[PDB]
Amino acid sequence: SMYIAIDGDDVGRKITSSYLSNSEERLTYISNKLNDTTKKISKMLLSNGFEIIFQAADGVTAKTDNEVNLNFVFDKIKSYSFDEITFSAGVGANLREAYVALLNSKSNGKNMISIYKDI
Amino acid sequence: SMYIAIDGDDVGRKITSSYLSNSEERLTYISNKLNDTTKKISKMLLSNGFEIIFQAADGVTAKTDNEVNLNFVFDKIKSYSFDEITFSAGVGANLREAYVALLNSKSNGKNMISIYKDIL
Amino acid sequence: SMYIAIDGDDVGRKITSSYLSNSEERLTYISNKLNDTTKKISKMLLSNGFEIIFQAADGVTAKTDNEVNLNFVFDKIKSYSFDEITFSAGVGANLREAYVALLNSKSNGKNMISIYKDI
Amino acid sequence: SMYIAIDGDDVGRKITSSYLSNSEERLTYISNKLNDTTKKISKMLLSNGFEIIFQAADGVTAKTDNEVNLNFVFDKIKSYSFDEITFSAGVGANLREAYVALLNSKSNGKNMISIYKDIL
C-alpha cells in the first residue's frame, strides 16, 4: 500500500507577486493553469493504477496497492510543469509518511520526490 | 471598481491534521467540501455581476463595476462555513489593496472582512 | 534520550497585525516579550537537565539523557504564555519525531504538547 | 522618517531539512549562525543611526529620521549571507509600507530590496 502526496513548489509566491503588482491577467493565468495541470496529474495517476484521495489546485494525493514505476510517474509530473511552477512529491506507506516525505522534498529543493523509508 | 479576495481560515492546519492522524476519510472530506464551497462562492459572485479573477483550492478573487451590497456578499460568504473552517475576505480598489486587506483579516481574527480604506 | 521542540503559536499573525496597523509600540512589545519568554523557557529546560540544541526567534529545541517530569516541564511552558501568545511542543526520541509531534500540536490547536509515540 | 523591515529567505526550509534528517549539528549551526547574523544586522543599523523596533532571529525592523545611504546599508546586509541563507528587505514611510515592500521582495526574488513607492 503506497501513498503519494504531490504539491506545487512555492506557488503562493507567484500568486502574491501577481497581487502586489496588480497583475490580473497573470493571476487568472495561474488559476487556469493550476486547474489544468492538476487535472493532467490526476488522470496520469489514475491511468497508472492510483486512487485519488485529495485533489485541490496545486495539491493531489493518491494511493495504490499495485506496483508502480515511481521514476516514470514522477517524470510525468515533471513534464507537466509550466513557467517557473513545478511540483514536488513524497511517497510513503501511509498518509503521515507521504506527508513527511513531501515536507522533506519541499525543504531540500524543488521539483524533487522523496520516499519516506529512504530518509 | 472593487476587488474582493476571499480565502479559508486555517484550512491548511485541518489538512495537515488529517495527514498526521492517517485520516483518509477526513482528508477526502476536506477536499470535496472545499471544492464545493468555492464553487458556491464563485456562483454567488457571478450572480452579483463580478468577474472571477482567480479560483483555486480555497481562494476566490473577483472584481466588479456594478453596485454591490458588501453586507449581503459577506453574509453569503459566512453562510458557507463548514466544520471548523471559516472564510475571510479583503476588499480594495485594486488587487494589491484587496490582498493587503485580506492579510489584515487573517492576521486579526477569523471569519472577518476588511476594507483596505478602513485600515489606513 | 528525549528531544523536545517548542515554538510559539501563530506568532506571525500577531506580528503581521502590528505591521498593518502601524502599531510600532505593539511590535516592539512583542519583540521583547518573545525574546524574554524564550529565554525563560531555555533557562527552565537547563534547570531540568536539558541541553539546548536550537534557540532562535519564537522556538527552543533541547534534548536530555537524564530523567524528566514532562507534566512539570510543559506546565511551566504554559505558565510562560503572555497576552494571546502561547507555545506548543513536540517530544520524540530524535529530532524528526520531536518535529513531527510539534507539527501535530500546531495543526490541532494551541498551547498543547504532543508525544510522537502517542500519535 | 524611513522604516526598514529585513527578513531571511528560506530560513525555515533549512531548519526543517535539519529536523527531518536528524542532523543535530546542522540545526545547532543554523541556530548559532542566525543569532550571529541578526546581531550583525542590528548593530549595522544602529551604526547607521537607526532605532531598532523589532529583533528576532532572521528578522530585524528599524526606523530612522536621519539621512541614510540605503545602498551601503543593504550591501552590508547582503554580505551577511551564509550558506544558502540570504536576506530580503522592504523600505517605506511607515511600518505597513515597509512590510508590504518586504512581501514584494520575498515574493519576487531572493536577496533583494524593495522601496514601497517603487511598487505603485
Author numbering:
A (entry chain A), C (entry chain D): 0 to 118
B (entry chain C), D (entry chain B): 0 to 119
Task: Give verbatim excerpts from the published study on this entry.
Panoptes is a two-gene operon, optSE, wherein OptS is predicted to synthesize a nucleotide-derived second messenger and OptE is predicted to bind that signal and drive effector-mediated defence. Crystal structures show that OptS is a minimal CRISPR polymerase (mCpol) domain, a version of the polymerase domain found in type III CRISPR systems (Cas10). OptS constitutively synthesizes 2′,3′-c-di-AMP and other cyclic dinucleotides to hold OptE in an inactive state. During phage infection, Acb2 or similar immune evasion proteins are produced that sequester the OptS-derived signalling molecule, leading to a population of OptE that is no longer bound to cyclic dinucleotide and is free to become activated, in turn disrupting the bacterial membrane and resulting in phage defence.
